Amino acid sequence: FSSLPSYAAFATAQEAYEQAVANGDSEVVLKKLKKSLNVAKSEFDRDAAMQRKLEKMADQAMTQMYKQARSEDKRAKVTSAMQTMLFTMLRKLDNDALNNIINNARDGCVPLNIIPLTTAAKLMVVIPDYNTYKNTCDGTTFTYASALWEIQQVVDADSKIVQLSEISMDNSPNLAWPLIVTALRAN
Amino acid sequence: FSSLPSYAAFATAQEAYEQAVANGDSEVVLKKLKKSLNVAKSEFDRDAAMQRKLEKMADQAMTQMYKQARSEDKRAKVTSAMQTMLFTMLRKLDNDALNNIINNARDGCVPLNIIPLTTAAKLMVVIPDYNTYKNTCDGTTFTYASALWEIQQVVDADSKIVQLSEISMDNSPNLAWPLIVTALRANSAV
């Protein structure tokens, strides 16, 4: 704390008294010098701690306000944060069935109900283009979620039944394409 | 802190004493200066301390009385709210059936569990599944508590209207099953 007038006064008094004492002198001069020195020393010493307490208190207050602002900010982005985190962990898991269904949904082939686990029960998906049908459906079997399923019904956007033999490269582009395959889980 | 009653005397004595010191007079005037200034500062000390104590005492008293006033205001508003709630719920007592069953008592006292059982106008039934449904409220009118009730509305756990034509054995697994049935007292109260 060397930026206060009290420090300047105390330093000048210290220098004057020290020089006078080192020069050598009587008792009355020493007494007068110390009576004029100690008041300035106390004046300096009070502020020397008051300033420190003020500075640390200000630092703590700024810390607390930063923490409050950050918490208020954080509690307002939870949906996006959670979605990003979930997909990061889904990457890190690295499973074949999960990767299969995520890529299928990313290209457009999403399911319509909860995927069953038993050797029975119906599953319905939507196939929006011929390329997805070429990749997944070949023959009369269906490969989805790293499993095997058996096609039993095909329905178009007009809800008319389409037989499996109908679908072909050039024979397809005269149809309502968002097909709906309903299959059951092969053993 | 600058216009205290003793401030004038203290400052005037200090100024006069320091002028005498600056006059370069003998040591007796210096001793008188020192004594007078010492006693002046000593008397200024308590005048500067007691006032500061008193101000803080007064501030504490003001704060306490303000919070007391706020507490009284809150009490008044909660009293008004409770009175309003009681007088609002009073207006649905059906004061003819209640009077009819009160007068039959031999001294005016009746169990509380039989007041809704004999004077209520509406009945609500919660049904877990279809097997329980077909044994309790099958059809459009059923009997319970020695009275006849007729159905008025049926909703599901999601609070959406459900028609009785689709509450069947085949269509049972397609409903949010905690069904709620509402009926009215027939021939009696509503």
Next chain:
Amino acid sequence: SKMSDVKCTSVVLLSVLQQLRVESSSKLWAQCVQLHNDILLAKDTTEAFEKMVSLLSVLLSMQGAVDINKLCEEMLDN
């Protein structure tokens, strides 16, 4: 380490599903809660994975909901 990862992922997935107002459909919410509670009690790491597939199918079969493709182009899921 392959089991705690799937349990944490299941917790995050259930939180994401709850954020999308799924508990406004009692049957779907009951099924999701059952699956989530069953995953956390698993002991072997095959049943947990099939239940995880079943639970993720619920989120995937909601068209508007989220953007699978944007959330896959942010140096995220492949």
Next chain:
Amino acid sequence: NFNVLFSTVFPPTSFGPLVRKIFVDGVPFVVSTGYHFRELGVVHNQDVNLHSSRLSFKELLVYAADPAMHAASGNLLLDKRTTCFSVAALTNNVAFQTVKPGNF
């Protein structure tokens, strides 16, 4: 000990608070002025006034905590989810409450 054994014969709708009608500035109320315990028998209140002027704060507090008015100003309820005795429903809807998962 004897009351516990003997109370299993009598109907279960005759137990609980006993209510009656009192008048406050000419309007009728319904308040509880006793109890019928399965163990302690019949108990009657000692300070009950039928006709009274406008009531104070503690009387409001006492009358707002009694289940008598709430039960008497509600609908009948028959709940088949549980086997415990049911009294009344305070609203026209049934509330379903869920529990959310944790944060990671």
Next chain:
RNA sequence: GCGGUAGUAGCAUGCUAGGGAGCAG
């Protein structure tokens, strides 16, 4: 020459009051 008293500053000790959090039945 020693002690007493009156303010002022720093430090330590135990309570009361307010706020935030953790565990257990």
Next chain:
RNA sequence: UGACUGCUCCCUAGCAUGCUACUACCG
């Protein structure tokens, strides 16, 4: 929508006590 107890840690404010220090009064 958030019960009754018990224990512990952290931060601030006040009170009481003690230690040291600086001036001043008194003998």
